[PDB]
Ligand binder design. Structure first.
Ligand code: COA
Ligand code: COA
Ligand SMILES: *[C@@H]1O[C@H](CO)[C@@H](O[C@@H]2O[C@H](CO)[C@@H](O)[C@H](O)[C@H]2NC(C)=O)[C@H](O)[C@H]1NC(C)=O
Ligand SMILES: *[C@@H]1O[C@H](CO)[C@@H](O[C@@H]2O[C@H](CO)[C@@H](O)[C@H](O)[C@H]2NC(C)=O)[C@H](O)[C@H]1NC(C)=O
Ligand SMILES: *[C@@H]1O[C@H](CO)[C@@H](O[C@@H]2O[C@H](CO)[C@@H](O)[C@H](O)[C@H]2NC(C)=O)[C@H](O)[C@H]1NC(C)=O
Ligand SMILES: *[C@@H]1O[C@H](CO)[C@@H](O[C@@H]2O[C@H](CO)[C@@H](O)[C@H](O)[C@H]2NC(C)=O)[C@H](O)[C@H]1NC(C)=O
Ligand code: CLR
Ligand code: CLR
Ligand code: CLR
Ligand code: CLR
Ligand code: R16
Ligand code: R16
Ligand code: NAG
Ligand code: NAG
Ligand code: C14
Ligand code: C14
Ligand code: C14
Ligand code: C14
Ligand code: C14
Ligand code: C14
Ligand code: C14
Ligand code: C14
Ligand code: C14
Ligand code: C14
Ligand code: C14
Ligand code: D12
Ligand code: D12
Ligand code: D12
Ligand code: D12
Ligand code: D12
Ligand code: D12
Ligand code: OCT
Ligand code: OCT
Ligand code: OCT
Ligand code: OCT
Lengths: 533, 533
């Protein structure tokens, strides 16, 4: 069954004789949202025979219930509660006769819920036990940077886990509009790593004497391939039917990577300078044309986001539309970003399932990989380029690399704190993956600099760790990505489940599929099969 | 719409006043079948106002119509006609008053049909024009046998064309029960070529000093991979949902190839002898244990096919069931072959769409790649092994190879003539791809020996032709096969058509997809990417 996943059963008994109750529901996660009708509860026909109604409430977040007298449109009582999954609760609405004529509604638990996050806890404990067992058991018995491969492999393992379902948990899934979950981390990290690799490969190629025009042809060919593979292979759902142009989605992940790669790689190619050999700022000073153009692009993004007038919609709007912001702007999902996407591409060539559609009930199409957020993708990739420049300019001195990584992490973290005001929905620019906002970029690039600060000495300098098992996927990232897209529905990545409303079975299936992709990458590494676009 | 593909419109006007007509229809292709009701036509309410009914008739083959008085169950008139696609015909049933009281029904053509095969004729003319233009334009300006690669590439091009739809023509599609179409040629040819390659590779490996146990491990590994790829990747339709065991089809194409390869390769490994150096019979005499075991297997197939009793079903039954054979054995599709498949695997693990379901209206599941026809697959592969033995034993002398190929083609053709009596449905053993009958094997192996007889001197000895563009697919057969299975629904192999009832649009789409697969194979050949199981 009667209940789906992440749902409880609520039974309302109305003991009032002369009032018709309507119960509205609102999630605590939904910001400035409208109350939606949950169930209508009729009046009690007789004393001692309360009228009963049943409803399913979502248990992912806290709930707010408002019981309003239908005839008078007046509030009877209000209730805030976090219901548990598969719980059985009853809400009794009676008038207290102890010298008053008020109404007191109180909530009781008929049947206790289940612990929804127990499979996650057990999976983490099992994984930690495996790590400890392997470590102790084995204890009793230019080249490629291994830390960048380890970082890319970590991002790939997370991407495969969350794309395949993430156990159907809300925190292994994209945030509705604002904030961060685990699913929102990996795409900016791919952009950052791609920028780092741009600098590393380009510097290696140019020091060996290759011409700039041959390298330009290489860049153009790779960008074209990325965009075409994204449009033709990854975006369409061919289980629904043959491709028709009028419903072809033009933007996407590999399209974003292709355009960002082209712009950043050509920008580095134009002003490429040789790497020379404690207090120096030459990695920043020697590339001031790049920085000037990046700040001009960021100024353009801020200007179009906060000052471009959108017809019939507020200027500077950063919300989701739908029922959000008290339903005043239902069709305004995205603000100027969505407006530009709909104006230049049309609604039929955009993403038809924005992540805001489930919490804010948005009805317009919005594409997270739209046109306006490509500016911030370019900013993220250029920050990755700076990470690569630190790695090569101060390659001899580990102390300089660590200080530079620490300083960049601190500066970007302070900018994120200033922009977000350390809050999900407040702040001048909240963190938003759909908009690819500025604070999203600064936050995730601060995380990336911290990750490099930890991985570089451990994996590359000291040698305490080889990166297993992450550098195996990290060296076949395009094969793993295109592969898990193509073979998403195939066995053994996906089989028929006994219970589709079970977190345990979904989690087990997704963990097994992720481990299988890591094993495939390991086999490809052993046989020295590597593909690069 | 009003009409589908390969359908005409028939209008029946009943001028009789006291008779109710029922019209039954029967195809000429359907052998010993029951008449099925086409349309019921009521009596004429008044003189001069004939009652009218409309029906769609199939235009692929000739039609037989029987108009029976419904009350008396007596035949009024019978009519044989080949209707044309999208034609508009009217059938008038009136009683002739010229001194008689009989009924004369005559058929008129209101609107002429279309030429359904015109796209095929135009495609052939365009292809021939391209060949002539290229030939004249270019005229004005151990190793691998190229003829075997050309043969495999021809089979692959035909397989991709007919699997992708074949233009939706009935002759580019599998025969219902008996006979041959173009779609029925390529699978036996793959088995034949695989046997030839077994002998060639095994002889090459054993002359270089490799041990027999390492080669046995190679054979077992390759067979296991073929069977697993068939079951897990090729057989399931993952557009319908995640894999469930109770509806997993166990047999299939690569499963047949894996089992046949294992048996034939191990049989050659056991009795492998070195190749020695006009009237000799040593290619046949030196492998008499293989021939003895092959004849024992063929005796087993004949015995189980003609003498195994099947419960509630005739012994030796070779028909399709359904409405065939006058509907006396509706559930007997396959005879003993289908009985063994259903007994050992169960109906749920068999093919659910046998080719007989459309013409004979069979309702049971029958699997063309079943257990009993593996014997005849093994016979086909062993005939391919004989072709390889001829190629290597008499490699020095082209004249000996040509005489041996001619003799084998003639013997197998004479056996096919004796078995089939040169007829689709008569003969002791008719040609049947579903049953993998003996005459099917002898006929297709005779064709294969003739193909080799033509290709070997032209491509390998004289050098008049390099095999373009067939040897490019012929060197990546497993990639092309698994690839066209995985990417069948993807663009550019498949797009949305303006008219799904058009032979021209389906044919154009399928030709384009086949050419794209040939181009992919050419690109893989240029970059020296070859995959072998
Ligand atoms: C597209 C994608 C392959 C980008 O690749 P990348 O980060 O540029 O890494 P590549 O393997 O392409 O590296 C290209 C170059 O960088 C160099 N490089 C890569 N890793 C390196 C390392 N650790 N050390 C030194 N050099 C390195 C390579 O040598 C190569 O140079 P070459 O052209 O001279 O051979 C990868 O990000 C991807 O798969 N995208 C998925 C996006 C995604 O999943 N987003 C999440 C939502 S689904
Ligand atoms: C499965 C399949 C790849 C069989 O392969 P095959 O015909 O045995 O050819 P392979 O490429 O596997 O050749 C294997 C060996 O034969 C040798 N060989 C192949 N072609 C050769 C030639 N022309 N000359 C000499 N040797 C050859 C190879 O060198 C190889 O030897 P090695 O293992 O020592 O390297 C192929 O039949 C197939 O794709 N099956 C599809 C079935 C089908 O589509 N049926 C129709 C219904 S869809
Ligand atoms: C439930 O009833 C309350 C009344 O107590 C409603 O609150 C009022 O809503 C109107 C909008 O129609 C506002 O103009 C008033 O300012 C609100 N008053 C207060 C005290 O909040 C509430 O809107 C009703 N719930 C729903 C879902 O309509
Ligand atoms: C939720 O809990 C209530 C308990 O209040 C269940 O209602 C009981 O159901 C049993 C079996 O049908 C009856 O014997 C009791 O008389 C019921 N009690 C009341 C107070 O109604 C209800 O069935 C539970 N719901 C689910 C889905 O389990
Ligand atoms: C149409 O009517 C004819 C009668 O002329 C049927 O033919 C007879 O069918 C019965 C079966 O019920 C046989 O026993 C007779 O031997 C048949 N007689 C002849 C002369 O053929 C015919 O079956 C009817 N058509 C259909 C579809 O039932
Ligand atoms: C098939 O042909 C008949 C001609 O006999 C068409 O019937 C004619 O339809 C037109 C337009 O509706 C009428 O003006 C004529 O009076 C009809 N003639 C008769 C004799 O009925 C019929 O429409 C055609 N069917 C199709 C699908 O094209
Ligand atoms: C020079 C570029 C690359 C970077 C800076 C671009 C900025 C300054 C541009 C881009 C979009 C522009 C805005 C677009 C539209 C309007 C609405 C109009 O009623 C007043 C001007 C105003 C508000 C513009 C002000 C300037 C603006 C914000
Ligand atoms: C060789 C001897 C000294 C054993 C070395 C212990 C290894 C296995 C331990 C010690 C320090 C550990 C690292 C410390 C911090 C991080 C955190 C995170 O970013 C990924 C894991 C990573 C990178 C750890 C991986 C495992 C690790 C490298
Ligand atoms: C020795 C093997 C490998 C090859 C030859 C097998 C032949 C001779 C076998 C296989 C199947 C057998 C048949 C299976 C079942 C029956 C039904 C029974 O009422 C009479 C015997 C009869 C008709 C058998 C006769 C012999 C038979 C035809
Ligand atoms: C080099 C000069 C002499 C030109 C040679 C002409 C070539 C292109 C011609 C001449 C004979 C032709 C072959 C003769 C017979 C067959 C029939 C069929 O099984 C496939 C095509 C094939 C194999 C032909 C392909 C094209 C062919 C090889
Ligand atoms: C969050 C998802 C967790 C998935 C776990 C993946 C890691 C397990 C890898 C198993 C394959 C090991 C191959 C390398 C052997 C050296
Ligand atoms: C019966 C289907 C016919 C399909 C035609 C396929 C042959 C055309 C091949 C085109 C690709 C040429 C690549 C080789 C160039 C040397
Ligand atoms: C409650 O709703 C029912 C449904 O029609 C209505 O008949 C009844 O009058 C309502 N009661 C009050 C007090 O409004
Ligand atoms: C023809 O069929 C109709 C349909 O019920 C029936 O009423 C009529 O009596 C039949 N005519 C004859 C002659 O049987
Ligand atoms: C949903 C709340 C968003 C919080 C954004 C991140 C705040 C912290 C800034 C980064 C600190 C740097 C630590 C590596
Ligand atoms: C090889 C000598 C130097 C030539 C300059 C190369 C410039 C390459 C980037 C400029 C092209 C930009 C295309 C949009
Ligand atoms: C030497 C090969 C050159 C190939 C050129 C391809 C042109 C397409 C350019 C794609 C640019 C995409 C980012 C805007
Ligand atoms: C010295 C060799 C020169 C090679 C020239 C290749 C140039 C390719 C340029 C592609 C530009 C695409 C811009 C969208
Ligand atoms: C409620 C969601 C908690 C997790 C949010 C993601 C932020 C923290 C994990 C990312 C840290 C990466 C290393 C700096
Ligand atoms: C000469 C320096 C050798 C490497 C020392 C690495 C120490 C710094 C590690 C930073 C990790 C921070 C984790 C909180
Ligand atoms: C549907 C008709 C089937 C006919 C079977 C084939 C008869 C000819 C035997 C093979 C002759 C050999 C020529 C290469
Ligand atoms: C290497 C020396 C000769 C050994 C004989 C090899 C026989 C291999 C085939 C027999 C195994 C059959 C398995 C079903
Ligand atoms: C050296 C590798 C050996 C692998 C052995 C695999 C065993 C599976 C055998 C498959 C036989 C299929 C035909 C019946
Ligand atoms: C000299 C090296 C010996 C290698 C031994 C490999 C033997 C593999 C046998 C597999 C048999 C599978 C039968 C189904
Ligand atoms: C009505 C169907 C006509 C075609 C049937 C297939 C047999 C003839 C073509 C195969 C010949 C292959 C070369 C010997
Ligand atoms: C790289 C651009 C590919 C665009 C694909 C368009 C698909 C068109 C299908 C035609 C049917 C309407
Ligand atoms: C959080 C601090 C990390 C280390 C920054 C300085 C490293 C230099 C000493 C080695
Ligand atoms: C109930 C079905 C469980 C399926 C488990 C999948 C295991 C994958 C390993 C096999 C790879 C081919
Ligand atoms: C090679 C054998 C593979 C068999 C695949 C079985 C799939 C089982 C799915 C479990 C859900 C019922
Ligand atoms: C149909 C006849 C083909 C040729 C058979 C004999 C070849 C030997 C002479 C060269
Ligand atoms: C109406 C749509 C026609 C599509 C034609 C397909 C052409 C394929 C060549 C492009 C390969 C990417
Ligand atoms: C057992 C695999 C490692 C732990 C995965 C945890 C996912 C919630
Ligand atoms: C980096 C400075 C951000 C501006 C602060 C905004 C406070 C509302
Ligand atoms: C134009 C491609 C070659 C001819 C194909 C004919 C298919 C009926
Ligand atoms: C090869 C001989 C076949 C037996 C002839 C059958 C005639 C009905």
């Amino acid at each position: 069954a009667e209940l789906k996943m992440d749902q409880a059963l609520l039974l309302i008994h109305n003991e009032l004789l002369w009032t018709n109750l309507t119960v509205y529901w609102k999630s605590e996660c939904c910001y400035h949202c409208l109350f939606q009708v949950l169930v209508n509860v009729p009046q009690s026909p007789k004393a001692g025979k309360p009228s009963a109604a049943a409803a399913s409430v979502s248990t992912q977040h806290g709930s707010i219930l408002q019981l309003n007298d239908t005839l008078e449109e007046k509030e009877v009582c209000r209730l805030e509660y976090r219901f548990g999954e598969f719980g059985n609760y009853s809400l009794l609405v009676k008038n207290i006769h102890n010298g008053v004529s008020e109404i007191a509604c109180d909530l009781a638990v008929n049947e206790d819920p289940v612990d929804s996050n127990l499979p996650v806890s057990i999976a983490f404990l099992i994984g930690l036990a495996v790590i400890i067992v392997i470590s102790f058991l084995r204890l009793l018995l230019p080249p490629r940077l291994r830390s960048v491969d380890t970082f890319r492999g970590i991002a790939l393992i997370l991407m495969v886990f969350v794309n395949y379902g993430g156990g159907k948990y809300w925190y292994f899934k994209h945030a509705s509009w604002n904030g961060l979950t685990v699913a929102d981390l990996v795409f900016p990290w791919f952009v950052f790593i791609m920028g780092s690799s741009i600098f590393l490969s380009m510097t290696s190629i140019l020091q060996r004497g290759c011409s700039k025009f041959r390298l330009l042809g290489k860049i153009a060919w790779r960008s074209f391939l990325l965009i075409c593979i994204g449009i033709i292979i990854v975006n369409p759902n061919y289980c629904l039917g043959p491709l028709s142009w009028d419903k072809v989605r033009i933007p996407g992940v590999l399209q974003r990577l292709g355009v960002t790669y082209f712009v950043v790689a050509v920008l580095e190619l134009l002003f490429a300078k040789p790497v020379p050999e404690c207090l120096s700022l030459r990695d920043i000073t020697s590339s001031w044309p790049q920085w000037l153009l990046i700040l001009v692009l960021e100024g353009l993004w801020l200007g179009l986001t906060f000052l471009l007038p959108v017809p019939g919609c507020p200027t500077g709007y950063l919300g989701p539309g739908g029922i959000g912001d008290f339903g005043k702007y239902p069709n305004c999902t995205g603000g100027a970003a969505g407006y530009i996407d709909r104006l230049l591409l049309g609604d039929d060539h955009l993403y038809q399932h924005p992540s805001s559609a489930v919490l804010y009930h948005t009805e317009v199409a919005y594409d997270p990989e739209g046109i306006l957020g490509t500016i911030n993708s370019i900013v993220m990739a250029f920050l990755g380029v700076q990470a690569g420049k630190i790695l090569l300019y101060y390659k001899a001195r580990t102390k300089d690399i660590l200080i530079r990584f620490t300083a960049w992490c601190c500066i970007l973290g302070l900018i994120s704190v200033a922009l977000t005001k350390v809050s999900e929905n407040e702040g001048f620019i909240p963190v938003n993956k759909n908009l690819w906002s500025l604070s999203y970029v600064t936050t995730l690039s601060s995380f990336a600099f911290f990750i490099l600060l930890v991985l570089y000495p451990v994996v590359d300098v000291k040698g305490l760790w080889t990166g297993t098992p992450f550098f195996y996927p990290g060296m076949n990232s395009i094969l793993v990505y295109v592969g898990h897209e193509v073979f998403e529905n195939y066995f053994p990545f996906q089989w028929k489940l006994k219970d589709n409303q079970s977190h345990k079975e979904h989690l087990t299936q997704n963990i097994v599929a992720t481990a299988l992709w890591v094993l495939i990458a390991y086999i490809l590494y052993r046989k020295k099969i590597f593909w690069k676009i």
